[PDB]
Amino acid sequence: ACPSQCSCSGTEVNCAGKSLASVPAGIPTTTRVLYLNSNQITKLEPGVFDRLANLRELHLWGNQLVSLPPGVFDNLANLEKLWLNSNQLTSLPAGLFDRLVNLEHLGLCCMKLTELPSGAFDKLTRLKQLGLDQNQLKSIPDGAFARLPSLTHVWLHTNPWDCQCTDILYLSGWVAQHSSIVGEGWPWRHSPDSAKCSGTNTPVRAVTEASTSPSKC
Amino acid sequence: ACPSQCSCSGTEVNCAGKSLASVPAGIPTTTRVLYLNSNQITKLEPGVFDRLANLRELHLWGNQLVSLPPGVFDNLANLEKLWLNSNQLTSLPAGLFDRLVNLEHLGLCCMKLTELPSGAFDKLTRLKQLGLDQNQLKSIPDGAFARLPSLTHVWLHTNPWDCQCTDILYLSGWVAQHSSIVGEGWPWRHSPDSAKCSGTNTPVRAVTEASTSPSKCP
Amino acid sequence: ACPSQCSCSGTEVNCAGKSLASVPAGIPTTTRVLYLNSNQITKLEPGVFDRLANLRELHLWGNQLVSLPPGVFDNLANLEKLWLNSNQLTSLPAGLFDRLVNLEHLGLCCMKLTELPSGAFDKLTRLKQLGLDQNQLKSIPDGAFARLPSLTHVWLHTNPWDCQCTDILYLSGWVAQHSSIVGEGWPWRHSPDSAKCSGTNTPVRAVTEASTSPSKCP
């Protein structure tokens, strides 16, 4: 029972590039792949996806979202790919991704993220690809990647990483350890020195405790 | 065990856009996603994918392939997406897709295909999306789509369909009966009149046997 | 005199990517390069650029403009580059570029243009690069490019050219004659067959009147 603005066949619903200001009503409950990208959507109602439990791929990139409701994805237990790139988010609510236990790809690039909440990714045991590039992050909270045992590809470049603050040391030691999975481009290419210290141009992985201080935090 | 030209982490190997003239040796057996697109590969050796039984997605688009070896995909029983868009193929060998019983997406657009072999798609019981747009096809062999029970999206536009010839009548009847799945664009948009007759720019789905003739076949 | 929203030094004013809904007030009259791309502008107020006669480069790309007022560019006698790529325009008003006699680059790609007004480019004696790719154009009005004596680079691909209709023949003879300037990509790469007939996949330069009809002109 397709939204008039969209095309629907099978389990795919394509509403992309239709100048929409909100998520249309009447997206079928059988939908598995939902394209809402490249619109002008300015917010998501809490509840807007409560009925779309069969989603595996959700494309929200290229909209104008400025925050997300904390429980907006809680019913999407089948979700495998989530693309939020190129919105205007500055933060993510605690618990946003907690129910997404089958998620394998998460695109967060090209926003204004300035921090991530501790535990943001703790439930994502299946996550393989995480894009955090081209945001405004200055550090990653301690242990933010410790429960991502499936991660094989991460993008961290093009952030203003603050390597003067002792807060960097989780990320420096993590990239040093996991350098094989740090890269850039689409599809991913290996690029472990692409996370750079915004002040000094030193690779994040090369930062040492002795050069940092808590008073620069 | 990555070829030096490529990047490899986890089960993905990215050799895209590396000016490669052939598929590099040493792609790991555990590979699931393999990007070979946007190179200068002009032929594939038989056997090249024989070790890569774990592949789920194989991207061969944007090369200069002018033929495919007949059994080149025979060991890829797990394959779900195969993209051959934008190569230079004019035909496909009989049997080529027979082993791809789990294939869900097949991209053949933007080549020079002038015909498809009879039975090309008969084994693809799980196929969902089939792209045949932007080729040089004039008709579809009788019963070509009869064993595609999973098909939900097909692209047939931008081909010079020959609507004078009796051979068009399978495709015309087919499009009429499956109009909900025929479209255009990426991702797909609904467009059932987008398969058009070369001589009149009339929709293919409107053709009836009253206007076709066996003597108008080339 | 910098708008608070933007950065200004020299004769360059950068208001790009600032989530703007309108052209900010007080852009200094000395401005030569104005970046207003990648915002949320849906319309322009008539007069908006009347004080900015010193502009040489105007960047409007990546907004959501739905139309342009007919004399919005009339005072920009110094303009050399004008970029309107990736807006939502479906047409252009008569005379819109008439005053832009020093224009050298004009980007009109990736919109929804369904036609070009007659005489749209007739005053653009210095135009060198013209991007019309990725629109909804079906044909070019007879003689539309006759007065572009400095044109060296044109992009015409990704439009649904209607080669069944007799009206295509201006454009087919023109691309045939000027094939060395037809291309794709940024920066431009040579690609003379990239303008294709939407119905048949024949290159537009290859079309002749043996295959067209005046009765097939919707």
Added chain:
Amino acid sequence: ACPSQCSCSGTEVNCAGKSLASVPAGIPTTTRVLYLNSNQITKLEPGVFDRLANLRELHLWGNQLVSLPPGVFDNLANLEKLWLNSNQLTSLPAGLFDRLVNLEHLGLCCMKLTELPSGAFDKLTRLKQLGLDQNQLKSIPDGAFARLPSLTHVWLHTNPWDCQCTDILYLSGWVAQHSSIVGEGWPWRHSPDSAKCSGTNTPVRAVTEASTSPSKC
């Protein structure tokens, strides 16, 4: 007589992204805009550009150049834009830019520059924009910018400025005095405190003489 690898129409030659190891022969003498970016060029042949006296724009960014011949630009009297971003240069030879008297844009970012020759920019009376960000620079020679009367935009961020050493005082006083033109981004955004001290992450323009010592240099 267009090189086989390239596309040429009018006065523009596009040889970008073609795996070239050298500049191809047969670039026309009438060429005004030359794209050689994004190739595999590690060195240029002496004289390679001597015939190309009509160039206005020369894109060399994204190669792997390790050095430049001192006279390689000498015949380019009409050059207005010169992009060398993202090569591997560590130094520049004396007088490299001396003949480029019409140059308006000069891109030197994203390399490995560890110093600039004094006098490097002394002939660039028309230079408007100068990108020096993302290198390894520790200071700027006394009077380096004194003959850049047209400069309106300079990027100095992401370099490890040594603010202990008295050699910084030319740059700190210059940035304090020309703070209106110091910025970041593409296109330029105003960011006067984006030049930062290596050991403190404090702004280079806030450096006092009392905090320095000629000893560390």
